[PDB]
């Protein structure tokens with residue numbers, strides 16, 4: 001078929017499975033969230049957002065309400081939203097919780113994804129004492145456990161992982177895992193993978209980091225333009241040229257906006273207004289114009305940071321007046337994602 005409705009498997013949408021309900025999880029996990037103290041005096045008592053119907057840890061309000069990430073009926077709905085958005089890859093946050101509830105949820109997500117031909121890759125988070133040895137062990141575990149699942153993502157035969165805050169690990173350690181000669185290499189093994197590191201700051205720092213660490217590519221994550229060098233879209237043409245010259249895969253991250261002031265009240269300078277979709281349009285256009293081979297979307301459902309494309313509805317409670325999609329309908333960001341996926345494919 002040539003309908004212009006099919007999923008794109010070079011489009012990765014960052015997905016968060018950390019939401020809970022009292023009924024399913026025993027707590028409204030993540031809808032309740034600590035308020036961060038301002039990093040710039042002592043004796044702050046910032047408190048917590050309680051995750052009641054009236055007061056959740058987002059400046060927006062989900063169409064699906066305070067949902068559980070373990071609810072198979074929510075997962076079905078999410079996969080139908082990925083189909084509407086044409087986003088073929090779900091990039092799943094992974095915190096190495098080592099608990100049965102995590103294992104269950106990952107299986108449910110893979111199963112629901114496969115029904116709609118969506119693929120799943122892992123976004124490896126900065127879990128406690130993360131290092132290249134336990135990363136290797138965990139890559140082995142994930143490939144062993146999930147590699148034969150029909151929804152497990154591969155690109156030209158290789159799994160792909162995004163590595164958040166990869167700068168927390170020195171290139172000399174990364175080399176041991178990712179150089180073909182590394183002491184604990186995954187290259188040429190059953191556990192080889194495309195490893196996509198986080199490009200943060202200026203080229204003088206990031207170019208040698210990426211080369212010396214032997215990453216296969218890099219992404220930028222942040223939905224807020226200008227937050228880092230890497231999340232400044234006017235740099236993307238030059239970042240892509242460097243990537244192509246050095247055999248690296250650049251996967252710029254685009255998002256519809258940013259606001260996290262319910263959980264970080266002091267972080268207002270990072271707010272990026274959605275402007276009825278114009279912000280998203282501008283950022284997505286820049287990624288496509290850079291001539292990249294793959295794009296990542298921040299985010300499907302990072303509700304705390306206001307980067308979500310998941311449908312949101314107007315809501316005013318006694319405790320908070322939420323933002324909403326304004327003149328646009330709740331599913332606008334899903335259908336606008338599909339529009340941009342089409343433009344990306346036309347360019348590929």
Ligand SMILES: OC[C@H]1O[C@H](O[C@H]2[C@@H](O)[C@H](O)[C@@H](CO)O[C@@H]2O)[C@@H](O)[C@@H](O)[C@@H]1O
Nearest residue numbers: 165200222223224227228260267270305
């Ligand atoms: O603006 C807040 C910011 O917090 C988090 O990012 C932190 C860290 O993980 C990043 O590597 C650096 C990059 O300079 O910034 C912070 O210290 C994320 O939650 C991010 O989405 C958010 O914007």
Ligand SMILES: OC[C@H]1O[C@H](O[C@@H]2C=CO[C@H](CO)[C@H]2O)[C@@H](O)[C@@H](O)[C@@H]1O
Nearest residue numbers: 014093123125126164221263302304305
């Ligand atoms: O937004 C609150 C959230 O912040 C941290 O998680 C990061 C936020 C966004 O994306 C990256 C990459 O997926 C996450 O690592 C962390 O402090 C969470 O506990 C917190 O809920």
